[PDB]
Amino acid sequence: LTPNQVNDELNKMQAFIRKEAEEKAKEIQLKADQEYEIEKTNIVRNETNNID
Amino acid sequence: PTVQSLSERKYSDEELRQDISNLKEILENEYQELTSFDEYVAELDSKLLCWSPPHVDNGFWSDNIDEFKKDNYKIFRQLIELLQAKVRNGDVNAKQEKIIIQVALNDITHVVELLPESIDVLDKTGGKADIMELLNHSDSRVKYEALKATQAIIGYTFK
């Protein structure tokens, strides 16, 4: 009814959506670093097998 | 079951559906990737019965029924002697004997319902008398498994 409750609810909903978006956003690079390290280790072993 | 029910109710993120769908294929194919004869012979030889995804299927007992038959059904007589020997030494209303009694009653009910020649091994060994008394005790799920095992052998008697 009042605009203060809708402004506080939208202000909390926007900050919660932004914090959930960033906190859900960090895991992509957080897993992508270990995936890139695993791919680099697999390529390094794949080259080291033929090198040996 | 949480991965199968969670696979239908996916989320907005594609990483959760790709992770649940990727883990569900390895989790489902992990138990199906093992042999039923090595799992049943390893579980029966180890003296530890437990439920599994491939243990509740009638195709495993039907496939291992011909390979198990080497001494006049000595494998089913050894499993029925393990279930009845567990019923005598280590009586019912226990936590340890209830899982092996329920798994041995389900596998004995599926193996008895699969072929009609395994009923002579139960009457010759003596585990058929404990199957009727095990239904009237506690653990009514295991009493329903023993009721299905007694109904499978009772179905071949009168048609």
Partner: protein, 56 residues
């Protein structure tokens, strides 16, 4: 006041999806950076084996 914050929340949802799209873009670039950083490691072991073969 709902008609002014509704477009701010609608643009905030698109910015929240754009942040996850940027993190998915950096996670997609991390595999190419791992492959580009891993493709050069074969020359050091090949030259290291060639140094041990030249020493023998």
């Amino acid at each position: 006041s709902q008609k002014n914050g509704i477009a701010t929340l609608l643009q905030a949802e698109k910015e929240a999806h754009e942040i996850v799209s940027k993190a998915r873009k950096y996670r997609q670039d991390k595999l190419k950076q791992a492959k580009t950083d891993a493709a050069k490691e074969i020359d050091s072991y090949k030259i290291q084996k060639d140094k041990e073969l030249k020493e023998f």
